[PDB]
Amino acid sequence: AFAVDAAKAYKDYLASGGQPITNCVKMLCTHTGTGQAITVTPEANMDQESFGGASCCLYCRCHIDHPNPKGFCDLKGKYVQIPTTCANDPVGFTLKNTVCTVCGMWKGYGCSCDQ
């Protein structure tokens, strides 16, 4: 019945003015990529930075179990594209945001499936 809520702890710590997790691994890339959120190689466009996935995953970085019941991580082994305006906190961004199942862009940061 009891489980640490890692997401909630970090979201609250952020709001209390805590320093975002650092040492997310930022990649060198052309910045001419598709812009999709989670890719097998870096896909940043001119508005995004590309990072190594694992270093941007709250569960990977905190040495705790993943929410997926079989323990699968969405980010490890891939690259997450982060809007340049949020690249100060890649971990928070990926926690607080959602990927569109249709076009693979961040809902609200690339997804335009409502037009």
């Binding site: 990649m27 060198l28 190594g52 995953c57």
Partner: protein
């Protein structure tokens, strides 16, 4: 003169041919720091230039390529070099990394422990090591050939590197090993490559290109490290990060290099020619299986 627009500088051949004695390394820019693009870690820049250089060699790049990366952790708890390797290597390439200390990684599998605990059933097409022992900083003595993890690496290459495969092994002035230089003579070509972002350091990657499983050339590793230090002592390299800004051609070309499971008798001069050219890999193509030996102890007296 055009050097600063390269990812780095490789040991010129005339220095390989010398018979210097070992001196102290004294670099004129020792300790200077490159200006890295915004928010880019040193080791992303260093591994990026290493891979940019490997792109100019005749690496074998088979389907279902197997790469292993030693010394992949960091005082950050993450693995920036692994991230660059996974960016560079064809998608789906199997990548295993390892380190003495725990870290989070994008490799397909990570083993924590001294590298001499690591075993693998299968052979590899590319071995990368950035292992460095921090006690090497305590220079109390002549700069002698070092054993430790280098002894493992030499064995690992002879036992588990596919013919036709390649290596890049980090050394410095004091973290080096004479058998590793000797083994370079067992590859079709070899060099010592200094990245431009770290040109102020005596670090280099000893690169062996296309393994032959026997000596093409007899190399005295003591003399050869003396030659390398002589080169670095007389050729100041200007810190540069220029090449980090062009990633258009960075990915390793998937050449589809053939893989055959031949036996030692079948390696004729023509096979050896294909190996030498990066056109063939020789190893089993079975499934990749790794493990780490764990010492068991019960401390309750």
């Amino acid at each position: 003169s055009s050097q600063a627009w390269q990812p780095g500088v490789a040991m010129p051949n005339l220095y390989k041919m010398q018979r210097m004695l070992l001196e102290k390394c004294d670099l004129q820019n020792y300790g200077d720091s490159a200006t890295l693009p915004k928010g880019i870690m040193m080791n992303v820049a260093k591994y990026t230039q290493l891979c940019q250089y490997l792109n100019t060699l005749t690496l074998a790049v088979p389907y279902n390529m197997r790469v292993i990366h030693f010394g992949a952790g960091s005082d950050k708890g993450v693995a920036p070099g692994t991230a660059v390797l996974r960016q560079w290597l064809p998608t789906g390439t199997l990548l295993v990394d390892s380190d003495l200390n725990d870290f989070v990684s994008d490799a397909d599998s990570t083993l924590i422990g001294d590298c001499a605990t690591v075993h693998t059933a299968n052979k590899w097409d590319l071995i990368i090591s950035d292992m460095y022992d921090p006690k090497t900083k305590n220079v109390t003595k002549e700069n002698d050939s070092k054993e430790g993890f280098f002894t493992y690496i030499c064995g690992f290459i002879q036992q588990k590197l596919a013919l036709g495969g390649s290596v890049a092994i980090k050394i410095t002035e004091h973290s080096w090993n004479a058998d590793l230089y000797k083994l370079m003579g067992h590859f079709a070509w070899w060099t010592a490559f200094v990245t431009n972002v770290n040109a102020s350091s005596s670090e280099a990657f000893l690169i062996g290109c296309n393994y032959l499983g026997k000596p093409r050339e007899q190399i005295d590793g003591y003399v050869m490290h003396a030659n390398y230090i002589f080169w670095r002592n007389t050729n100041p390299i200007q810190l540069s990060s220029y090449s980090l800004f062009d990633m258009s051609k960075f990915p390793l070309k998937l050449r589809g290099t053939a893989v055959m499971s031949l036996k030692e008798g079948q390696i004729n001069d023509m096979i050896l020619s294909l190996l030498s050219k990066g056109r063939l890999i020789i190893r089993e193509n079975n499934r990749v299986v790794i493990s780490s030996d764990v010492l068991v102890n019960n401390e309750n007296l």
